[PDB]
């Protein structure tokens, strides 16, 4: 039994973390084959940066690349969107099987927080609908990566770039394309209003049922339209026919039809939790996907 | 910024996890140097589960009755010894991935990371605390047994928990790596139960100090309290009594925020008398007791 906020084992990714230094700026790089990936704002001096020019003007020896106590020699450099690629003289002997993926809002991943190329902590995250993440990042955390594991293949999906005024976090996929309407300048930027990831709440209520927690279940059923009208009143994501099909395995497993569980969720939105908890939370949790619930409640290895 | 339940990177422990088989029972082992440590109930059949005589079953085992497997490689068992409730298996090869490690027995309130493993392959990593009643609120299915709890201090791994059994209230019990149970439990399928759990008061106060540091002050008041008056009230809410020792430990957080420990205790007191009233601290509508004073300083300062 049990239900925990659970990260992927971070071992495969720890074998890839390095330290990148430019003048006085130090942050983290992802060392895969003979290339080190890191945010391009590493090159930046104190003084609206012109990255293209700052990059082309700069020699190879200006990039100090440190893998533990070993120096890596940079033998090339190129830009891809908002990520800098440093061509190194050594293929990473610890390189796992990996692909770069870009994730949709509501999709979850593990962040490996690092400082000075040194992995510090791992935590589970969700891509918010406003494309921010509620992470935990201090100074030097930039270049820290988000990832999933599928068997032995690490799918890297996130590189950390910045903290927003609301204490929430912004970054790019490993191809340097920002998630959300952001720019890597010190310019004034702000998270749009977040919404609750409805399908995830429903998956987590299924996790509640599976662990013997049933007080919120009722005998009513609703329709998508009625549910979706109530949802957008509480800043909940619309529920699609897609979502309903993806929760099917959980509906089948528990014997509770999705459109019933939507009625249960509706009552909770309108009525609150009545001084009760669900899986030990006073808040409806939306950072577990349907897959996450199936993975944890079936067990799955790598 | 941000405040996340945060586990240690699992790489150094992933390198040590093995699968141990005896008869039809397979669970997980911890492979350190030329010893595999695992729960001794791996040698129990179905019948044995109620009043196992461990000495009488192990005296009936040869080395070759224990299958130890590391990935594809089957390890060769060359000696078997019992220490309390862990079995120690001497093996041909010393684990080359052996990190700096020590074995540590922790006290209730102390936190660690759990690497949930099945068939010697890791499933996920989460962060736990030893509950006052010597149980943990884990996430463990069939065959999770021998999964370990650890902390990492620089590059030294300290092993503090090995997983043995699930109690009827869906909470978990285990031993230190010397095989002495945390709490009054025994590795038998006889009727046993956890004492009533209490809230880890020192940890909730730590979490409140973090809240101020991350800029949230909605909950403070202008009162102070005596240590005795605090405990007289706090026990009435099933809180762990606060000791002078605990007050000493909070000194640094008290210094950094400028809020006296007994002033913070007045705040906590009022929160219990009222509750949240729809408001939250650090994204929670409950009081968090699974961050220690050390955890908070590490994640918010440096
Ligand atoms: C190890 N592979 C399992 C794992 C359990 C069940 C799912 N999550 C877990 O932590 N553990 C066991 O097989 C141990 C083992 C005998 C019985 N047992 C139990 O987990 C049982 N609990 C108790 O012994 C009891 F009653 F005291 F709570 C069970 C009732 C099956 C849950 C031994 C030797 C303790
Ligand atoms: C909040 C701050 C003023 C620091 C700024 N944010 C904004 O620019 C905004 F406020 F305008 F949004 C910001 O983070 N950066 C400024 C500069 C890079 C980025 C940066 O160096 N990031 C930190 C790096 N190791 C990570 C931080 C530390 C604490 N928690 C984090 O995550 C770039 C946007 C090019």
Q: Ligand 2 centre from A275 Cα, in Å?
A: 39
Q: Report the DSSP beta bridge partners of residue B239.
A: B199
Experimental determination technique: X-ray
- Name every chain A residue with its beta carbon within 8 A of the beta carbon of B286: 277, 280-282
Residue B41 a catalytic site member: yes
Taking the CB of residue A102, how many other CB atoms lie within 10 A of it? 15
| Protein residue closest via CA to atom 18 of ligand 2 | A162
Rounded Cα gap, residues B233 and A143, in angstroms: 47
Residue A157 a catalytic site member: no
DSSP string, B109-154: T-EEEEEEEETTEEEEEEEEE--TTS-B-----TT-TT-EEEEEET
Taking the CB of residue A242, how many other CB atoms lie within 10 A of it? 9
CB of B216 less than 8 A from some CB of A: no
Please give the class, per CATH, of domain B11-91: mainly beta
Nearest CA-CA partner of B40 in A49, B64, B49:
B49
In the 3-class helix/strand/coil scheme, how is chain A assigned residue by residue?
A: CCCCCCECCCHHHHCCEEEEEECCEEEEEEEECCEEEEEHHHCCCCCCCCHHHHHHCCCHHHEEEEECCEEECEEEEEEECCEEEEEECCCCCCCCCEEECCCCCCCEEEEEEEECCEEEEEEEEECCCCCCECCCCCCCCCCCEEEEEECCEEEEEEEEEEECCCCCEEEECCCCCECCCCCCCCCCCCCCCCCECHHHHHHHHHHHHHCCCCCCCCCCCCCHHHHHHHHCCCCECCCCHHHHHHCHHHHHHHCCCHHHHHHHHHHHHHHCCCCCCECCECCCCCCCCHHHHHHHHHCCCC
Tell me which of A186, A188, A191 to substitute to probe ligand 2's pocket, judged by most ligand atoms within 8 Å of the beta carbon: A186
Tell me which of A83, A158, A163 to substitute to probe ligand 2's pocket, judged by most ligand atoms within 8 Å of the beta carbon: A163
C-alpha distances out from residue A221 to A85, A216, A224, A260, A262, Å = 53, 13, 10, 4, 8
Taking the CB of residue B273, how many other CB atoms lie within 10 A of it? 9
SS3 assignment, position B103? strand
SS3 assignment, position B173? strand
- Chain B residue closest to A115 (CA)? B302
Q: Report the DSSP beta bridge partners of residue B44.
A: none
Does ligand 2 have an atom closer than 6 angstroms to the CB of A138?
yes
Q: What CATH code is assigned to B201-301?
A: 1.10.1840.10
The answer to whether A283 and B285 are in contact (CB under 8 A) is yes
Rounded Cα gap, residues B195 and B134, in angstroms: 9
The answer to whether A116 and A144 are in contact (CB under 8 A) is no
Helix, strand, coil distribution of chain B in percent, nearest 5 = 25, 30, 45
Tell me how close the Cα of B110 comes to any Cα of chain A, in angstroms.
Answer: 17
C-alpha distances out from residue A187 to A49, A50, A162, A164, B127, Å = 11, 14, 11, 11, 36
Select from B6, B14, B137 the Cβ nearest to the Cβ of A9: B14
Domain A12-88 annotated CATH 2.40.10.10: yes
Q: What CATH code is assigned to A198-298?
A: 1.10.1840.10
Rounded Cα gap, residues B110 and B290, in angstroms: 8
Nearest CA-CA partner of A62 in A117, A26, A23:
A23
CB of A188 less than 8 A from some CB of B: no
Q: What is the resolution of this structure in A?
A: 2.5
């Amino acid at each position: 039994s049990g239900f925990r906020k659970m990260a992927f084992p971070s071992g495969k990714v720890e074998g890839c973390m390095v330290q990148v230094t430019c003048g006085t700026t130090t942050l983290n790089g992802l060392w895969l084959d003979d290339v080190v990936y890191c945010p391009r704002h590493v090159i930046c001096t104190s003084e609206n940066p012109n990255y293209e020019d700052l990059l082309i003007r700069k020699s190879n020896h200006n990039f100090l690349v440190q893998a533990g106590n070993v120096q890596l020699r940079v033998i090339g450099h190129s830009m891809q969107n908002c990520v800098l690629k440093l061509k190194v003289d050594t293929a990473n002997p610890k390189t796992p099987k990996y692909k770069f993926v870009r994730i949709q809002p509501g999709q979850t991943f593990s962040v490996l927080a690092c400082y000075n190329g040194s992995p510090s902590g791992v935590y589970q995250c969700a891509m918010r609908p406003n494309f921010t993440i509620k992470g935990s990042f201090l100074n030097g955390s930039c270049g820290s990566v988000g990832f999933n594991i599928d068997y032995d293949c690490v799918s890297f999906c996130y590189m950390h770039h910045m903290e927003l005024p609301t204490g929430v976090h912004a970054g790019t996929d490993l191809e340097g394309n920002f998630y959300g309407p952001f720019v890597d300048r010190q310019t004034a930027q702000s998270a749009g209003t977040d919404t609750t990831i409805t399908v995830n709440v429903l998956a987590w209520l299924y996790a509640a049922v599976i662990n013997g927690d049933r007080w919120f279940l009722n005998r009513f059923t609703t329709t998508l339209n009625d549910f979706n009208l109530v949802a957008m009143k509480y800043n909940y994501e619309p529920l699609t026919q897609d979502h309903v099909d993806i929760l099917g395995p959980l509906s089948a497993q528990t014997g509770i039809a999705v459109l019933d569980m939507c009625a249960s969720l509706k009552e909770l939105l309108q009525n609150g939790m009545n001084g009760r908890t669900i899986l030990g939370s006073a808040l409806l949790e939306d950072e577990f996907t349907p897959f996450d619930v199936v993975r944890q409640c079936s067990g799955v290895t790598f």
